[PDB]
Amino acid sequence: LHSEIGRLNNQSLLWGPYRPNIYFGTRPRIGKSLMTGLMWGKIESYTDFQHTVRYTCEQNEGMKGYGWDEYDPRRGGIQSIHDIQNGLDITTSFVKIPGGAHGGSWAARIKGTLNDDAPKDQKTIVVFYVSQEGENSELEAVPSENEFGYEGDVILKGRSEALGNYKLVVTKGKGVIPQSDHDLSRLRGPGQTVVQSLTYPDEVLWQAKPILFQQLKAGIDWLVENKYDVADPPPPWQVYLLANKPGSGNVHIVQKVFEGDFEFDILFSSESAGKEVTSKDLEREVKQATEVFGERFARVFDLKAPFQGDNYKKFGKSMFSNLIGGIGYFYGHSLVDRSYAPEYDEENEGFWEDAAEARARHQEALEGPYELFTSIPSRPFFPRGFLWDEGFHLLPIADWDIDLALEIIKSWYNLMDEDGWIAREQILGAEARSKVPKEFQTQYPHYANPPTLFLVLDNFVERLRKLDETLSTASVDNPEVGLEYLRRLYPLLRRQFDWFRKTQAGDIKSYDREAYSTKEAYRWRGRTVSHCLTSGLDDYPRPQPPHPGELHVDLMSWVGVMVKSLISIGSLLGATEDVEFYTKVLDAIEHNLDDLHWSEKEGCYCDATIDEFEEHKLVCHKGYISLFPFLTGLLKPDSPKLGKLLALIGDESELWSPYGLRSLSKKDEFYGTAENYWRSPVWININYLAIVQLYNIATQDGPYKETARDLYTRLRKNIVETVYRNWEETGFAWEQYNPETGKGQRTQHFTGWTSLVVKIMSGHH
Ligand SMILES: O=[N+]([O-])c1cc(-n2nccn2)ccc1NCCCCCCN[C@H]1C[C@](O)(CO)[C@@H](O)[C@H](O)[C@H]1O
Numbered sequence: 001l002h003s004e005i006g007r008l009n010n011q012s013l014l015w016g017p018y019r020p021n022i023y024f025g026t027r028p029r030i031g032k033s034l035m036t037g038l039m040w041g042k043i044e045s046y047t048d049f050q051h052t053v054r055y056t057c058e059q060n061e062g063m064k065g066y067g068w069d070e071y072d073p074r075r076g077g078i079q080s081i082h083d084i085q086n087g088l089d090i091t092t093s094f095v096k097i098p099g100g101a102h103g104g105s106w107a108a109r110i111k112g113t114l115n116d117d118a119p120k121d122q123k124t125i126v127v128f129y130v131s132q133e134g135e136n137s138e139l140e141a142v143p144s145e146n147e148f149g150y151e152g153d154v155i156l157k158g159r160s161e162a163l164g165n166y167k168l169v170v171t172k173g174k175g176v177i178p179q180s181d182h183d184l185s186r187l188r189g190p191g192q193t194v195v196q197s198l199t200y201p202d203e204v205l206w207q208a209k210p211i212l213f214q215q216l217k218a219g220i221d222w223l224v225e226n227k228y229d230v231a232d233p234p235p236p237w238q239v240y241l242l243a244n245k246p247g248s249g250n251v252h253i254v255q256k257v258f259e260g261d262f263e264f265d266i267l268f269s270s271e272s273a274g275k276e277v278t279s280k281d282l283e284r285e286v287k288q289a290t291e292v293f294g295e296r297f298a299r300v301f302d303l304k305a306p307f308q309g310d311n312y313k314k315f316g317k318s319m320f321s322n323l324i325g326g327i328g329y330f331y332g333h334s335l336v337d338r339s340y341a342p343e344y345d346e347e348n349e350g351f352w353e354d355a356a357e358a359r360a361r362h363q364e365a366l367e368g369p370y371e372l373f374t375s376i377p378s379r380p381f382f383p384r385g386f387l388w389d390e391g392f393h394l395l396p397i398a399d400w401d402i403d404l405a406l407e408i409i410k411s412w413y414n415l416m417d418e419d420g421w422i423a424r425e426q427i428l429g430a431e432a433r434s435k436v437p438k439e440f441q442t443q444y445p446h447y448a449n450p451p452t453l454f455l456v457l458d459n460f461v462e463r464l465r466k467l468d469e470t471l472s473t474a475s476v477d478n479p480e481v482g483l484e485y486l487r488r489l490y491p492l493l494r495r496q497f498d499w500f501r502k503t504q505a506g507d508i509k510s511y512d513r514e515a516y517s518t519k520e521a522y523r524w525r526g527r528t529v530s531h532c533l534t535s536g537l538d539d540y541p542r543p544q545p546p547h548p549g550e551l552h553v554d555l556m557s558w559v560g561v562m563v564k565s566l567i568s569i570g571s572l573l574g575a576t577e578d579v580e581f582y583t584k585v586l587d588a589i590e591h592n593l594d595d596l597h598w599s600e601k602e603g604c605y606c607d608a609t610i611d612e613f614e615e616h617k618l619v620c621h622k623g624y625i626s627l628f629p630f631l632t633g634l635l636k637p638d639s640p641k642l643g644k645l646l647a648l649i650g651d652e653s654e655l656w657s658p659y660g661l662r663s664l665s666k667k668d669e670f671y672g673t674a675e676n677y678w679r680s681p682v683w684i685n686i687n688y689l690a691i692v693q694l695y696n697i698a699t700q701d702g703p704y705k706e707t708a709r710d711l712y713t714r715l716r717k718n719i720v721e722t723v724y725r726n727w728e729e730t731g732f733a734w735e736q737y738n739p740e741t742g743k744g745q746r747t748q749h750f751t752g753w754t755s756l757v758v759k760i761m762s763g764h765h
Pocket residue numbers: 377382386388389435436437440536537538
């Protein structure tokens with residue numbers, strides 16, 4: 001039965017607009033297969049199109065905004081793009097139609113509406129670009145009746161092992177197609193839809209922009225050669241319209257030119273399914289998908305006071321659809337340093353210099369291929385998998401569709417190497433690598449990242465304890481299915497656990513350090529003088545200078561989170577030997593957090609180092625780090641230490657700003673210094689953990705019940721309102737928020753853990 005659900009899930013999730021790095025494109029969850037992409041740009045001159053054409057996602061002054069208004073990966077959705085540079089409001093509707101044996105069918109509608117400021121007679125070039133990778137697969141454009149191109153639809157017929165037979169149609173569409181009275185029209189046609197069919201070596205098919213331009217340039221060179229000149233030039237758009245050359249190949253370029261408003265359809269018809277997909281099919285399914293999205297939203301993200309109003313609902317749908325709409329499929333090789341240079345052990349004072357020398361050896365090599373199905377922090381700036389981010393992304397997603405979340409978790413854990421390492425950033429394939437400078441592609445098997453995917457597993461366990469609709473929840477509705485899933489994953493969870501304790505271990509035994517356990521102490525590998533990228537909190541101040549004797553309270557708390565989940569899952573599977581080992585580790589972390597990390601003087605947890613005189617020193621910087629035991633759910637509700645932390649959380653002169661909790665205290669000497677990344681700004685991911693823990697204390701008997709209730713109420717309010725105010729003003733989710741002004745700053749389109757706001761609004765943890 002588990003196997004059966006598995007196959008139905010596979011078939012449900014196969015097709016998607018799973019190329020979030022571009023404005024609009026489709027690929028299936030198959031490494032070497034059929035991919036599509038949309039390009040458009042106005043043409044006003046002989047030289048402008050190369051600067052106006054749009055393809056990969058960006059964010060600058062020429063783009064107002066873009067994102068998904070509604071999206072469900074099983075059904076599809078609607079995206080809105082607001083392009084100032086090209087004077088266009090664009091809609092892309094995508095819809096999946098289940099059927100046959102091959103992942104089903106889909107269709108898309110592309111609609112362009114000139115905005116008020118555009119010339120009514122603007123010429124806009126639109127290209128649909130289609131590639132297919134694979135040794136044995138075929139794809140052919142049926143030629144037109146007409147000499148020079150297509151009056152009606154363009155049909156591509158193709159076959160592959162993965163997809164069987166299929167047909168992909170690009171429809172004629174609605175809108176004025178401009179006509180040229182030039183001489184050139186005797187050879188190139190007055191103006192019509194054109195197709196060029198080409199072939200390149202498989203591994204470069206993703207390079208749609210250069211491939212397209214190489215064709216445009218050959219078109220222009222042909223003009224020059226055949227005596228078309230500045231004495232009498234064809235209009236720009238006709239100079240940039242490819243000569244029609246349909247045929248067979250692994251690349252097909254479908255090009256149309258429109259004057260004014262346009263719309264056209266893409267219909268992918270899986271032959272193994274019923275009748276083929278029509279435009280009337282698409283309209284119906286689009287309407288239907290909306291309805292279903294509407295209902296599921298109202299049940300799953302039913303926003304509680306004071307966010308019940310329709311304004312916060314629109315906001316909620318936008319933050320949610322952009323998060324779930326960022327889901328991508330990636331495939332390819334990664335760049336890994338597999339030297340295990342001894343310098344990476346970081347055992348010496350000055351270790352950061354040793355490690356730089358090992359890096360300078362450049363022993364990294366491509367390895368794989370790997371695949372990954374994950375959501376992402378940002379379409380324009382970070383369109384790829386991030387380990388601790390994904391823990392946050394999946395919390396709202398799991399509410400929506402637990403089976404989908406579990407798929408993504410599975411996908412991540414399938415990357416894990418024999419040692420238990422998962423790279424904190426998954427740059428898979430040359431396409432993914434094009435967006436990342438060479439110097440930052442290399443992954444390092446000694447680099448951890450917070451194990452936040454365990455939080456999702458906690459939510460799933462608690463749910464398990466207590467057709468598209470059915471599949472979304474099959475893993476909780478059929479207890480048998482959930483347990484089997486946990487059975488298969490449990491070994492990998494434990495391998496990761498062991499890996500942390502093996503590679504991220506701190507040094508108790510070789511220093512004058514007293515503590516309850518001699519085992520439980522952690523230090524993030526990978527720190528530089530100014531940074532600790534592996535912790536997730538890039539530049540939060542840490543002991544200076546870095547030192548093999550450092551201990552990190554955040555890392556120890558993350559180990560706590562892991563043991564707790566291993567206890568819960570271990571029990572469910574009855575692994576009793578295991579459960580008792582974990583129990584004693586948890587016990588030891590509880591004591592050791594106090595012995596090594598608690599400052600009585602400062603009233604909070606701190607990182608530690610060892611002195612000039614080789615004794616243990618607490619190093620306190622009041623901020624997110626300081627609350628870690630509390631954030632991660634490790635403190636007893638009656639704890640006096642907890643009450644001291646509530647004091648710190650609540651204190652306006654420290655952490656509490658009108659906009660949410662500051663990353664670092666205003667009192668800390670490092671407040672707002674250097675790059676000021678994690679040294680004052682408000683971050684939604686950590687605010688979310690605080691909110692969730694405040695609510696936990698607020699809805700149980702204990703001494704802090706009422707303080708927690710007050711803080712919970714206020715902090716939920718401030719975080720949602722800060723994110724909502726900025727969304728209203730700017731159209732975007734931001735990476736972080738300014739505690740002095742409330743303004744969003746750094747990266748836009750950060751959905752991204754900023755979307756946790758949908759969960760905070762809807763309450764009832
Ligand atoms: O600055 N580069 O070296 C660089 C430049 C480009 N680039 N610039 C122009 C073209 N390409 C691309 C990549 C890199 N990588 C180095 C890493 C520095 C930025 C790290 C920020 N990490 C935050 C976001 C996030 O990492 C993800 O949400 C969270 O996980 C963390 O927690 C957050 O703190």
